[PDB]
Amino acid sequence: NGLTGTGVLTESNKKFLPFQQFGRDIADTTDAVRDPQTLEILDITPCSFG
Amino acid sequence: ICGDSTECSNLLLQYGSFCTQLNRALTGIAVEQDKNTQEVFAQVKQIYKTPPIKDFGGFNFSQILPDPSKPSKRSFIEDLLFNKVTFNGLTVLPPLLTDEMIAQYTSALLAGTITSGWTFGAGAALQIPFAMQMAYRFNGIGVTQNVLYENQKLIANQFNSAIGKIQDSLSSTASALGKLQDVVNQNAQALNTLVKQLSSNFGAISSVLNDILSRLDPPEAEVQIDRLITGRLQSLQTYVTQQLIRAAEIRASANLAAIKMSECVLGQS
Amino acid sequence: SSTASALGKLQDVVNQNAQALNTLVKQLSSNFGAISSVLNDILSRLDPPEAEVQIDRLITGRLQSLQTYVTQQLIRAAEIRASANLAAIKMSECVLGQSKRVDFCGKGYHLMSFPQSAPHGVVFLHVTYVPAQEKNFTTAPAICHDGKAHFPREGVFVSNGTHWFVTQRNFYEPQIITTDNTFVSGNCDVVIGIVNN
Amino acid sequence: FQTRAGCLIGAEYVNNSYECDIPIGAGICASYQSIIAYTMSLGAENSVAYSNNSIAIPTNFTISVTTEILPVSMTKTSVDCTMYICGDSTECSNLLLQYGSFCTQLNRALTGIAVEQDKNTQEVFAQVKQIYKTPPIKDFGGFNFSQILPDPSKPSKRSFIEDLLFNKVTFNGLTVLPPLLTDEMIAQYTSALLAGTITSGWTFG
Numbered sequence: 001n002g003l004t005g006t007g008v009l010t011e012s013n014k015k016f017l018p019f020q021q022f023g024r025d026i027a028d029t030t031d032a033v034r035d036p037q038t039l040e041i042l043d044i045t046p047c048s049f050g
Numbered sequence: 051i052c053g054d055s056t057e058c059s060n061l062l063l064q065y066g067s068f069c070t071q072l073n074r075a076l077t078g079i080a081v082e083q084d085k086n087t088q089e090v091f092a093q094v095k096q097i098y099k100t101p102p103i104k105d106f107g108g109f110n111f112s113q114i115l116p117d118p119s120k121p122s123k124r125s126f127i128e129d130l131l132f133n134k135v136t137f138n139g140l141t142v143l144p145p146l147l148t149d150e151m152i153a154q155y156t157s158a159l160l161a162g163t164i165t166s167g168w169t170f171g172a173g174a175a176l177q178i179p180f181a182m183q184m185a186y187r188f189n190g191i192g193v194t195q196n197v198l199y200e201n202q203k204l205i206a207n208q209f210n211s212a213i214g215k216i217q218d219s220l221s222s223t224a225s226a227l228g229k230l231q232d233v234v235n236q237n238a239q240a241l242n243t244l245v246k247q248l249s250s251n252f253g254a255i256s257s258v259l260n261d262i263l264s265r266l267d268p269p270e271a272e273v274q275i276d277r278l279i280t281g282r283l284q285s286l287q288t289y290v291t292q293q294l295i296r297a298a299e300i301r302a303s304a305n306l307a308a309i310k311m312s313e314c315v316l317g318q319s
Numbered sequence: 320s321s322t323a324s325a326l327g328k329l330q331d332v333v334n335q336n337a338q339a340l341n342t343l344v345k346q347l348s349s350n351f352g353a354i355s356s357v358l359n360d361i362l363s364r365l366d367p368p369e370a371e372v373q374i375d376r377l378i379t380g381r382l383q384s385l386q387t388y389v390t391q392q393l394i395r396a397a398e399i400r401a402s403a404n405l406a407a408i409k410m411s412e413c414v415l416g417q418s419k420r421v422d423f424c425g426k427g428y429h430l431m432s433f434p435q436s437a438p439h440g441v442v443f444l445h446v447t448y449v450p451a452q453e454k455n456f457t458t459a460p461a462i463c464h465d466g467k468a469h470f471p472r473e474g475v476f477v478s479n480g481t482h483w484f485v486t487q488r489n490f491y492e493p494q495i496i497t498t499d500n501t502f503v504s505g506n507c508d509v510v511i512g513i514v515n516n
Numbered sequence: 517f518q519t520r521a522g523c524l525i526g527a528e529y530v531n532n533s534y535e536c537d538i539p540i541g542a543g544i545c546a547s548y549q550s551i552i553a554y555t556m557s558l559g560a561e562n563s564v565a566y567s568n569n570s571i572a573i574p575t576n577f578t579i580s581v582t583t584e585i586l587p588v589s590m591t592k593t594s595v596d597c598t599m600y601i602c603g604d605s606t607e608c609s610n611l612l613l614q615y616g617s618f619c620t621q622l623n624r625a626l627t628g629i630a631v632e633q634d635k636n637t638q639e640v641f642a643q644v645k646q647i648y649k650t651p652p653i654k655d656f657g658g659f660n661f662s663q664i665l666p667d668p669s670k671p672s673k674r675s676f677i678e679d680l681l682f683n684k685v686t687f688n689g690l691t692v693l694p695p696l697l698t699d700e701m702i703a704q705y706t707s708a709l710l711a712g713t714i715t716s717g718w719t720f721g
């Protein structure tokens with residue numbers, strides 16, 4: 001929904017209130033989204049490097 | 051700086067070899083940290099053990115000797131200390147020595163100093179009963195050893211009570227470990243502000259490379275990318291310099307700690 | 320003579336200085352966003368009105384590089400000064416005298432030291448004394464005689480199984496116990512470990 | 517194999533425990549036999565025979581000589597602001613003029629560093645007030661200092677060990693200034709200190 005980025009998407013157990021769309025933790029980095037077509041909380045994790 | 055943008059990578063390619071130096075500095079810092087720990091703790095050649103029967107003339111080292119029941123093999127005071135104090139291209143490497151190895155070094159040092167005295171710091175450890183080692187240590191501050199043997203029980207009780215009080219003072223009163231705490235806080239603050247700095251506009255049209263790339267043609271997209279690049283390079287250099295200063299300070303503290311270990315633990319000062 | 324790589328610290332200092340100087344030299348061959356890394360060409364190719372812009376790019380890049388080099392030099396100088404202060408203290412305390420602080424110069428009991436010079440530093444030869452060939456003995460903290468306690472003036476009481484001697488604390492040299500190397504203090508009813516002799 | 521540090525390919529983990537050879541991390545490291553990896557062994561293991569009426573007294577001794585190496589100085593360098601960042605161009609100099617006095621500060625800093633280096637060497641070595649000499653006949657109770665005392669044969673005034681040490685280790689606006697004290701002077705200080713400590717003891721300090 002216009003919020004772009006890369007990473008791996010997993011299932012998450014967070015609980016947004018009925019009007020948020022996504023989340024962030026500290027330094028304002030997105031780490032959870034709600035898919036519009038299902039209204040369930042996903043989870044974003046950057047894919048590995050080293 | 052780039053975050054997987056080929057255009058950004060090519061643009062940054064022509065800024066010389068700043069990044070090799072930037073990586074070399076951090077690598078040197080990490081190796082220095084490992085050396086610091088090594089030279090502070092690895093003062094002994096063998097791993098001494100304390101005998102099962104513990105009759106040290108009435109003294110009581112239970113609160114300091116390791117407890118085998120616990121899985122960390124730590125001691126009571128060490129447990130109190132450990133309980134009391136508490137990705138965008140960033141990596142954290144693990145220290146070479148684990149906490150169990152450090153606790154084993156500490157246990158070896160303390161068992162050697164209980165059982166042999168100062169002799170294990172020079173050559174091979176030589177055993178001697180604890181009471182007549184404290185007699186030697188009284189002899190080293192101008193009191194005849196006489197005085198020790200005629201007040202042994204009183205001295206042992208005073209020592210035990212002092213240990214109890216230090217236990218209670220640590221266990222109840224907080225804010226006694228500000229140094230390690232604010233070292234951790236300073237490092238966290240530095241990383242936090244470095245990460246937050248990526249949201250700065252720096253005088254460009256936006257703070258995200260994808261928008262600039264997909265908003266307008268290359269010719270001035272290059273100018274905007276250049277603005278972002280110079281801002282982020284400035285931030286990174288500032289971070290690295292502050293890290294080097296703090297590393298020098300920590301190294302000074304580590305050298306002082308090594309000297310204190312060598313002089314006040316392996317001998318009488 | 321045989322083993323190499325034993326002089327790591329001085330070699331590392333030399334290599335660090337050489338690397339810093341080399342990268343400073345090589346940084347001259349970069350563009351920093353201009354059209355060329357050579358000044359004469361951009362002077363001789365295009366209209367000055369924008370040549371000032373290109374030259375400004377070069378100027379700011381090279382100032383940045385120079386400033387970074389200077390700061391690194393300052394940090395390294397502070398570290399070397401700390402090392403030199405330590406070396407001066409070691410020379411003062413272990414060459415001009417005999418030290419008591421443990422392991423400050425040499426592992427063992429310090430006897431003396433000798434200095435030698437090296438291309439950018441000093442090499443101390445510490446001569447120390449190390450005991451060896453231990454042995455077992457039985458000990459007691461005092462001796463009861465005529466109801467009086469006796470303590471050794473200097474030494475420690477030992478026994479080889481049948482007789483009791485007093486020795487020094489770092490070299491086995493037994494001597495007969497005599498009223499001249501021991502002193503008396505009180506009756507022996509309060510000392511834990513007294514033996515009769 | 518798999519580790520806390522990461523994933524390791526081309527090595528075989530073993531249950532043994534030797535001294536650490538190539539530190540891999542998180543408490544493990546590797547060596548060659550093929551290539552093997554293992555967990556560090558902090559050292560040997562002994563239990564000293566404590567008892568409340570037993571001591572151990574040495575009966576013999578040994579004398580040991582060990583080395584310790586310290587750096588005291590680095591090369592003194594200086595850099596020409598203008599000829600570096602401009603390369604003999606009038607326009608570059610004119611443009612640089614309006615930046616204020618930046619590289620005056622740089623030259624000041626480098627000068628301070630060089631002066632500091634000279635001070636470092638002066639403090640380390642100039643510990644004596646005179647220049648003592650060793651007597652021609654050398655009977656130090658059977659001790660033998662020949663490898664350490666300088667020999668007049670070679671035209672270097674350096675000793676055997678000093679020669680081994682000196683053999684073991686080996687412009688675009690930048691200049692290197694020579695140190696104030698030449699190497700023969702430093703060798704003379706070391707010889708003075710060493711003759712003084714051989715003949716007088718600690719009294720001359």
Ligand SMILES: *[C@@H]1O[C@H](CO)[C@@H](O[C@@H]2O[C@H](CO)[C@@H](O)[C@H](O)[C@H]2NC(C)=O)[C@H](O)[C@H]1NC(C)=O
Pocket residue numbers: 036037038039
């Ligand atoms: C959006 O559309 C989807 C699909 O068109 C709807 O999905 C429904 O999902 C439930 C649960 O799996 C099914 O029982 C329905 O049959 C689905 N409907 C259809 C039309 O397929 C979804 O409900 C719609 N609304 C939201 C808010 O997602």
Ligand SMILES: *[C@@H]1O[C@H](CO)[C@@H](O[C@@H]2O[C@H](CO)[C@@H](O)[C@H](O)[C@H]2NC(C)=O)[C@H](O)[C@H]1NC(C)=O
Pocket residue numbers: 110111112113
């Ligand atoms: C050393 O001190 C500890 C106290 O920390 C003693 O442990 C106590 O022992 C008594 C009797 O055995 C118990 O009633 C307490 O509950 C113990 N306290 C703890 C915290 O365990 C220990 O006994 C002392 N050492 C010796 C040899 O007596």
Ligand SMILES: *[C@@H]1O[C@H](CO)[C@@H](O[C@@H]2O[C@H](CO)[C@@H](O)[C@H](O)[C@H]2NC(C)=O)[C@H](O)[C@H]1NC(C)=O
Pocket residue numbers: 479480481482
């Ligand atoms: C302990 O030391 C004493 C002192 O030397 C030993 O006693 C001497 O033993 C020799 C050898 O038999 C005799 O010639 C001497 O006459 C003994 N001394 C006296 C005063 O009688 C003793 O043998 C040693 N014991 C052990 C177990 O080493």
Ligand SMILES: *[C@@H]1O[C@H](CO)[C@@H](O[C@@H]2O[C@H](CO)[C@@H](O)[C@H](O)[C@H]2NC(C)=O)[C@H](O)[C@H]1NC(C)=O
Pocket residue numbers: 463514515
């Ligand atoms: C060492 O001390 C004395 C030396 O004569 C002796 O102990 C005495 O033993 C007798 C016999 O039982 C008692 O009547 C005395 O009261 C004891 N003396 C004292 C001071 O109590 C014996 O040779 C040795 N005793 C011990 C305990 O080692």
Ligand SMILES: *[C@@H]1O[C@H](CO)[C@@H](O[C@@H]2O[C@H](CO)[C@@H](O)[C@H](O)[C@H]2NC(C)=O)[C@H](O)[C@H]1NC(C)=O
Pocket residue numbers: 453454455563564565572
């Ligand atoms: C001093 O005596 C003790 C007790 O006999 C020695 O300790 C034991 O020595 C035997 C060798 O005869 C070993 O097999 C045991 O493992 C030792 N026990 C412990 C707990 O270490 C000790 O070695 C003797 N000291 C010497 C010979 O210097």
Ligand SMILES: *[C@@H]1O[C@H](CO)[C@@H](O[C@@H]2O[C@H](CO)[C@@H](O)[C@H](O)[C@H]2NC(C)=O)[C@H](O)[C@H]1NC(C)=O
Pocket residue numbers: 105568569
């Ligand atoms: C050293 O050992 C203990 C204290 O560590 C004491 O000796 C005890 O003496 C009683 C009776 O006198 C015996 O029943 C014990 O078996 C002894 N214990 C041991 C470990 O030997 C005493 O303080 C010291 N002297 C002796 C001879 O043991």
Ligand SMILES: *[C@@H]1O[C@H](CO)[C@@H](O[C@@H]2O[C@H](CO)[C@@H](O)[C@H](O)[C@H]2NC(C)=O)[C@H](O)[C@H]1NC(C)=O
Pocket residue numbers: 576577
């Ligand atoms: C102390 O150690 C020294 C060094 O090993 C011993 O000297 C040795 O003695 C044996 C027998 O006399 C000779 O074969 C060796 O050549 C000697 N070594 C050297 C380096 O000269 C000395 O004997 C030991 N002390 C005692 C009392 O035995």
Ligand SMILES: *[C@@H]1O[C@H](CO)[C@@H](O[C@@H]2O[C@H](CO)[C@@H](O)[C@H](O)[C@H]2NC(C)=O)[C@H](O)[C@H]1NC(C)=O
Pocket residue numbers: 660661662663
């Ligand atoms: C001090 O040690 C040196 C060893 O470097 C001795 O010099 C050797 O002496 C022997 C016997 O005269 C010669 O065969 C060697 O060729 C000498 N070595 C060198 C490098 O010249 C010296 O003799 C010893 N001092 C004394 C007084 O004997």
Ligand SMILES: *[C@@H]1O[C@H](CO)[C@@H](O)[C@H](O)[C@H]1NC(C)=O
Pocket residue numbers: 531
């Ligand atoms: C090594 O240790 C593991 C873990 O205890 C054990 O399962 C194994 O049998 C041991 N021996 C070998 C040869 O792996």
